[PDB]
Ligand binder design. Structure first.
Ligand SMILES: [K+]
Ligand SMILES: [K+]
Ligand SMILES: [K+]
Ligand SMILES: [K+]
Ligand SMILES: [K+]
Ligand SMILES: [K+]
Ligand SMILES: [K+]
Ligand SMILES: [K+]
Ligand SMILES: [K+]
Ligand SMILES: [K+]
Ligand SMILES: [K+]
Ligand SMILES: [K+]
Ligand SMILES: [K+]
Ligand SMILES: [K+]
Ligand SMILES: [K+]
Ligand SMILES: [K+]
Ligand SMILES: [K+]
Ligand SMILES: [K+]
Ligand SMILES: [K+]
Ligand SMILES: [K+]
Ligand SMILES: [K+]
Ligand SMILES: [K+]
Ligand SMILES: [K+]
Ligand SMILES: [K+]
Ligand SMILES: [K+]
Ligand SMILES: [K+]
Ligand SMILES: [K+]
Ligand SMILES: [K+]
Ligand SMILES: [K+]
Ligand SMILES: [K+]
Ligand SMILES: [K+]
Ligand SMILES: [K+]
Ligand SMILES: [Mg+2]
Ligand SMILES: [Mg+2]
Ligand SMILES: [Mg+2]
Ligand SMILES: [Mg+2]
Ligand SMILES: [Mg+2]
Ligand SMILES: [Mg+2]
Ligand SMILES: [Mg+2]
Ligand SMILES: [Mg+2]
Ligand SMILES: [Mg+2]
Ligand SMILES: [Mg+2]
Ligand SMILES: [Mg+2]
Ligand SMILES: [Mg+2]
Ligand SMILES: [Mg+2]
Ligand SMILES: [Mg+2]
Ligand SMILES: [Mg+2]
Ligand SMILES: [Mg+2]
Ligand SMILES: [Mg+2]
Ligand SMILES: [Mg+2]
Ligand SMILES: [Mg+2]
Ligand SMILES: [Mg+2]
Ligand SMILES: [Mg+2]
Ligand SMILES: [Mg+2]
Ligand SMILES: [Mg+2]
Ligand SMILES: [Mg+2]
Ligand SMILES: [Mg+2]
Ligand SMILES: [Mg+2]
Ligand SMILES: [Mg+2]
Ligand SMILES: [Mg+2]
Ligand SMILES: [Mg+2]
Ligand SMILES: [Mg+2]
Ligand SMILES: [Mg+2]
Ligand SMILES: [Mg+2]
Ligand SMILES: [Mg+2]
Ligand SMILES: [Mg+2]
Ligand SMILES: [Mg+2]
Ligand SMILES: [Mg+2]
Ligand SMILES: [Mg+2]
Ligand SMILES: [Mg+2]
Ligand SMILES: [Mg+2]
Ligand SMILES: [Mg+2]
Ligand SMILES: [Mg+2]
Ligand SMILES: [Mg+2]
Ligand SMILES: [Mg+2]
Ligand SMILES: [Mg+2]
Ligand SMILES: [Mg+2]
Ligand SMILES: [Mg+2]
Ligand SMILES: [Mg+2]
Ligand SMILES: [Mg+2]
Ligand SMILES: [Mg+2]
Ligand SMILES: [Mg+2]
Ligand SMILES: [Mg+2]
Ligand SMILES: [Mg+2]
Ligand SMILES: [Mg+2]
Ligand SMILES: [Mg+2]
Ligand SMILES: [Mg+2]
Ligand SMILES: [Mg+2]
Ligand SMILES: [Mg+2]
Ligand SMILES: [Mg+2]
Ligand SMILES: [Mg+2]
Ligand SMILES: [Zn+2]
Lengths: 87, 50, 50, 122
RNA sequence: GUUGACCUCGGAUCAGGUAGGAGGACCCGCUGAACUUAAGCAUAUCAAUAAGCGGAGGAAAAGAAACCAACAGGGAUUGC
RNA sequence: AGAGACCGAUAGCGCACAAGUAGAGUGAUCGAAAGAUGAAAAGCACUUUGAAAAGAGGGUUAAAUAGCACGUGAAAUUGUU
RNA sequence: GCGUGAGCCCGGGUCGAACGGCCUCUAGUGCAGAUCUUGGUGGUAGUAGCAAAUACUUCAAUGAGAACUUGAAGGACCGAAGUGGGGAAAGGUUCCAUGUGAACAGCGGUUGGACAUGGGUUAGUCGAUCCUAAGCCAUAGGGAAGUUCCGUUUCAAAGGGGCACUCGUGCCCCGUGUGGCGAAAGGGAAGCCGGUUAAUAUUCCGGCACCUGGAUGUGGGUUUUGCGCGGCAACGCAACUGAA
RNA sequence: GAAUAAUUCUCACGCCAGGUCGUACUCAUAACCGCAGCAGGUCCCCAAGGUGAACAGCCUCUGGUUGAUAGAACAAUGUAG
RNA sequence: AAACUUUCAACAACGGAUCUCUUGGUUCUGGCAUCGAUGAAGAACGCAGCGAAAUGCGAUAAGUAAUGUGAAUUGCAGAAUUCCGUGAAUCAUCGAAUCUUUGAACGCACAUUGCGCCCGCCGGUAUUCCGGCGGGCAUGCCUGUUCGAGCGUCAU
C-alpha cells in the first residue's frame, strides 16, 4: 500500500515562508530556515556549490544605495551647491 | 474606524452613528458609514460628492 | 480554508492582479516583440507555493 | 490651472506655503471624488496637482534646513542628519592634524639636516 | 563619638563614543581527507592540497641580523 | 577602457530574446526551449458566396515564387499529374 | 565534358549581396555504425480499443447544426453507517450575472469548475487575541581553535507598593524567587427571534437583551448611646464598614 | 465616620465607550493528494415509515440525481450469473 | 484492362538543413581603490491618463529641486511651453531633499499586521480611564560624572 494509497495522507506542511529570504523553507517545528539559516546572525553559504552562491550574490537585487557610490567617488565626495544657483 | 470617523467630520462635515469595514479580495478596504437620522444621505451625495 | 492570516491574504491578492492579458495598444508600438502573456497561471494547472 | 512654478515659490515665507499646500490638497481630493462617472480634460489636471504638491513640500523642507544649519554654526555637537556623510571608513580616519605630528627629537633633526638641492658636474 | 579620606566591587533610558553584517579573485592563520600511483598493499604518494573555521587591504605579508660565510670577506625585506 | 590569424544561434557563458526566467522537488537543490517580413506597413479599401472560420474577384509592392503559420527553404515522409 | 580515383568544369530553373584562382602560413579540417547526442519523420494503422457503479422515452421552444441545452409529462436509482443538510486540514476566486470564433470537456455541444467583461465577504456578544501542557529558547555561569555546546534556578548584590509634590527632584513600607514562546478539538466575561440579496449574514434592517471598564446623581437603607433585623434550629430578607 | 447631618451602603434606576485581523465557495466517482475531470486515499456533527431481535438484507417519504461515446446484429473463444 | 506495390520528373505539402547577417560571448592588455548602527547586501508590498511582465521609483512614489542644452514626446489622447521670458524632453549632468514594511535589526514577540512601558500636546467632566498626534526604551566594552556597598582599611 506504499505508493498511490499512501500519497492521499499528505495534508500538512514541513516548511513555511521565511521572513528574511522569502522562500518556502522555514522549518515549522525547528524554526530554522533551510536556505538562509535564519535566525542566525550570518547567512548560510558554502563553497561546494558555486551555483547557489551566484543566485544570491551582490548585484542580483536593486542596489538601492550602493549603486550611487561610484558617482560620488568620482566627484570627490563634495558638498554644497553650484555657485550662484537659486534656492 | 476611529480615524475614518474623524476624517469624514473634518473633510465633509458629516456625522455618523456607526461604521463597518472590510478588506476586499484585491487588497483594498471598504467602509460603510451610517448617518444620523436627521440628515438625508441622498441630499449629501448631491451637494458634496457627485 | 476560511481561516486565514493576513500575510497569506496579502499574497492571494497579488496573485490574481498578475493574471490578466496584455493591453491592445502595447502591440502597436515601434519595435515591439511581445505577443501574449507568458506567465499566465490557472488554479487547475499549476500550484503556487503559498 | 493647477500648475505652480518653482520660480515664484522661493520668495515666500512659511505661512503662504502652508496655505497654498492646503488649497492644492482640497482641490486634488475633489477631482478624485468626481473623477468617476465622467472623463475628460480634467484627467491631466490631477497630474499637474500632485506634481505641484511635491514642489511646495520641497521648498518648505529646504528653507527649514537652511535655518537649522545657521543655528548650529559654531556649536560642538550637531544632529546626526546635519553631519557630513562621506563613508563609514572615511569618518574613522585620523585627522590631518593628528596624522602629521612628530616627536621633539625628530623635529630638531629636520631643522638642521633637511634634504638639499644639489648638482654633480660631468 | 562624630566627621573626613583611601582600596576593592556595583547601579543608572547618567555625558560622549565604539563592534557585529555583506564581500572573500588575490592576502594572514587554524583544522584536515579519500579517490589515485606503487601493475597487489600497511610506511610512502596524491598533499603540508579539496571541503570546514577565524581576521584585513588596495595590495596584504616580510623587513633594518642572536644573518651569510671561512673569503683579499659580504651587509634590512620582497620578486625575476 | 582598448584589442585579437577566437565562436557565428545544436557554436560561443546555463542565458544574443520580460534567463538564473518558465517548470520540477517537503527540502538542500535541479534548471530549459526560444534571433532574420519589407527601403517604407504601403499590414489588402470595395463587390460577391458562406451561420462563421474562410474562398473567389479586385488592390499595395521592384517582388505576395515576401501576407505577420512571414529572407533563402535541403532530406526523411506525403498528394495530384 | 574532363580525371584510374577522391573530385573538377559547363548548360537550364529558383534566388537576392557578397565570392574565387595561384605560392606560402595555420587548424576545434573529411563519418554508416559507438543499445552514440539533439531534432524531425515512417510502417504497424484508420488498427488495439473508447464494455464496473440497473435506464431511458414523448411533445414543444432555442439554434446554421441538438442522445448528452431549457419547460412540461411519463419511467427509474440513492433509501437517513444517503448520490441529503453543514464543518476541520488543503486549495485560492473555482462564487454571481451577461456574452462568446478557436483551443479544453479521449463521441457531440447552442451547455461548462473552460474563454472575455463586470460584481460580490459588514461583529464589544462567533473565533484569533488571554492561560498553561508535552516541549523550545534568552539571562548567571562552565566547555570548545571555532562555526557554537551545555545550563532554566543555579556557587547571582536578579523585585514592587504607597504618599504629597508650590512644581518631577522628596519621603515611607514589604521582600525566599527571579524571563518569553508554545492549543482556530484542552481552560475561558457577554445575543435571541422575524425579514431582507443575483451573490453576505447569530455580522445588514426591525424588535427585544446581555457583559466588561470608566464617571457619577436621585430614590431607598443605617446611624441620636456609631457599622441592620427575624427564626429553638437547619437558615431567611432589596441593602446592611473592613487594610496587612 | 452623625445628631443635622454623616455614610469606600456587593439595593433600584440613571450617563459614556468597547480598537485590530478572518468571514465568498468546495470538502470530493470533477474544486484536496496520487503527472489527470484517475473505480485508490483523506478527521467529525444531524439521522424518518414498514418487515424484523436488530444501524442485517429488501421496499417507501423529505431532499437529491437521471452523469459516465452511441446505433444495429446475436458466430467462435471468453468474463460474470 | 483497372485498382494495388515499386522507380524517376514537375508542381503542391511536411520539416527547418544550407548560404549570408549579428546592439552577444570568450581570451589578452592598460587605468583606478569607493559598502554598513548617519541602518548595508538581500526580501516583501505598492506607484503611470489608458500596464500584466521587464526597466525605474517610494504616500514628494513611472518621480521633486538644482545646473547645462535648446524644441519636443509619439501606439492613442489631451494639454503644456512655442525660446519675450516665466523653457519641450523616459535628454545630459548631479553638489540639495523624499525614501512604506523588513533585514546585522535594536521595548518583548511574530505560524499573530500580537502585547507593553516612559515624556509631551490636543479632545472627551480627568495626574490615574478612552481616542488622536509627536519623541523615546537592545547587548558587550572604553573614558568621564553621580549615587552607593564591605570591621578591606587610615586618622580624629
Ligand atoms: K561608577
Ligand atoms: K578569476
Ligand atoms: K570554508
Ligand atoms: K543552452
Ligand atoms: K516548486
Ligand atoms: K530592381
Ligand atoms: K501581385
Ligand atoms: K522572398
Ligand atoms: K542558372
Ligand atoms: K478516423
Ligand atoms: K453503467
Ligand atoms: K445510478
Ligand atoms: K472581537
Ligand atoms: K455598542
Ligand atoms: K488573527
Ligand atoms: K486582543
Ligand atoms: K515546561
Ligand atoms: K560561550
Ligand atoms: K483555545
Ligand atoms: K453585500
Ligand atoms: K436617603
Ligand atoms: K434594613
Ligand atoms: K460569512
Ligand atoms: K459560509
Ligand atoms: K475544510
Ligand atoms: K424500521
Ligand atoms: K432494516
Ligand atoms: K452473444
Ligand atoms: K459468444
Ligand atoms: K549559418
Ligand atoms: K517593479
Ligand atoms: K504572545
Ligand atoms: Mg513534523
Ligand atoms: Mg534661501
Ligand atoms: Mg473586521
Ligand atoms: Mg546616555
Ligand atoms: Mg564579520
Ligand atoms: Mg585524479
Ligand atoms: Mg595500486
Ligand atoms: Mg592497476
Ligand atoms: Mg585495490
Ligand atoms: Mg579551502
Ligand atoms: Mg575596502
Ligand atoms: Mg604595489
Ligand atoms: Mg604592512
Ligand atoms: Mg640593530
Ligand atoms: Mg662581514
Ligand atoms: Mg641582503
Ligand atoms: Mg573584445
Ligand atoms: Mg535554433
Ligand atoms: Mg546556446
Ligand atoms: Mg527564420
Ligand atoms: Mg484576398
Ligand atoms: Mg525575389
Ligand atoms: Mg511551415
Ligand atoms: Mg519562406
Ligand atoms: Mg522528398
Ligand atoms: Mg537584404
Ligand atoms: Mg574534430
Ligand atoms: Mg549520420
Ligand atoms: Mg566504420
Ligand atoms: Mg475496433
Ligand atoms: Mg468508459
Ligand atoms: Mg475494456
Ligand atoms: Mg444521458
Ligand atoms: Mg439497491
Ligand atoms: Mg430503491
Ligand atoms: Mg457558476
Ligand atoms: Mg454561460
Ligand atoms: Mg471531445
Ligand atoms: Mg467539437
Ligand atoms: Mg462551445
Ligand atoms: Mg477563468
Ligand atoms: Mg467568545
Ligand atoms: Mg540554549
Ligand atoms: Mg560561556
Ligand atoms: Mg502564548
Ligand atoms: Mg477551546
Ligand atoms: Mg457599568
Ligand atoms: Mg472580613
Ligand atoms: Mg452559500
Ligand atoms: Mg461533505
Ligand atoms: Mg477519486
Ligand atoms: Mg489534483
Ligand atoms: Mg416489531
Ligand atoms: Mg453498444
Ligand atoms: Mg461459466
Ligand atoms: Mg532601509
Ligand atoms: Mg505612508
Ligand atoms: Mg510613538
Ligand atoms: Mg552601546
Ligand atoms: Zn530564509
Amino acid at each position: 500500500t506504499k505508493g498511490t494509497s499512501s500519497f492521499g495522507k499528505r495534508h500538512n506542511k514541513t516548511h513555511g515562508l521565511c521572513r528574511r529570504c522569502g522562500r518556502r523553507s522555514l522549518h515549522n517545528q525547528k524554526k530554522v530556515c533551510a536556505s538562509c539559516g535564519y535566525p542566525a546572525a550570518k547567512t548560510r553559504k558554502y563553497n561546494w556549490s558555486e551555483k547557489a552562491k551566484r543566485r544570491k550574490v551582490t548585484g542580483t537585487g536593486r542596489m538601492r544605495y550602493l549603486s550611487t557610490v561610484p558617482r560620488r567617488f568620482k566627484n570627490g565626495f563634495r558638498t554644497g551647491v553650484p555657485k550662484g544657483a537659486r534656492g | 474606524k476611529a480615524q475614518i470617523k474623524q476624517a469624514l467630520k473634518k473633510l465633509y462635515d458629516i456625522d455618523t452613528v456607526k461604521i463597518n469595514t472590510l478588506i476586499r479580495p484585491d487588497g483594498t478596504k471598504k467602509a460603510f458609514a451610517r448617518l444620523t437620522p436627521d440628515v438625508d444621505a441622498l441630499d449629501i451625495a448631491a451637494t458634496k460628492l457627485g | 480554508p476560511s481561516h486565514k492570516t493576513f500575510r497569506i491574504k496579502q499574497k492571494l491578492a497579488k496573485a490574481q492582479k498578475q493574471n490578466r492579458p496584455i493591453p491592445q495598444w502595447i502591440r502597436l508600438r515601434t519595435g515591439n516583440t511581445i505577443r501574449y502573456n507568458a506567465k499566465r497561471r490557472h488554479w487547475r494547472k499549476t500550484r503556487l507555493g503559498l | 490651472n493647477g500648475k505652480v512654478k518653482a520660480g515664484q515659490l522661493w520668495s515666500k515665507n512659511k505661512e503662504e506655503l502652508t496655505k497654498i499646500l492646503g488649497e492644492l490638497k482640497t482641490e486634488l481630493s475633489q477631482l478624485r471624488i468626481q473623477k468617476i462617472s465622467s472623463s475628460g480634460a480634467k484627467l491631466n489636471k490631477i497630474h499637474d496637482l500632485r506634481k505641484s504638491i511635491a514642489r511646495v513640500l520641497t521648498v518648505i523642507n529646504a528653507k527649514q534646513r537652511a535655518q537649522l544649519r545657521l543655528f548650529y554654526k559654531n556649536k560642538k555637537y550637531l544632529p546626526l542628519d546635519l553631519r557630513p556623510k562621506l563613508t563609514r571608513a572615511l569618518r574613522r580616519r585620523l585627522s590631518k592634524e593628528d596624522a602629521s605630528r612628530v616627536l621633539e627629537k625628530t623635529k630638531k633633526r629636520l631643522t638642521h639636516f633637511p634634504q638639499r638641492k644639489y648638482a654633480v658636474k660631468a
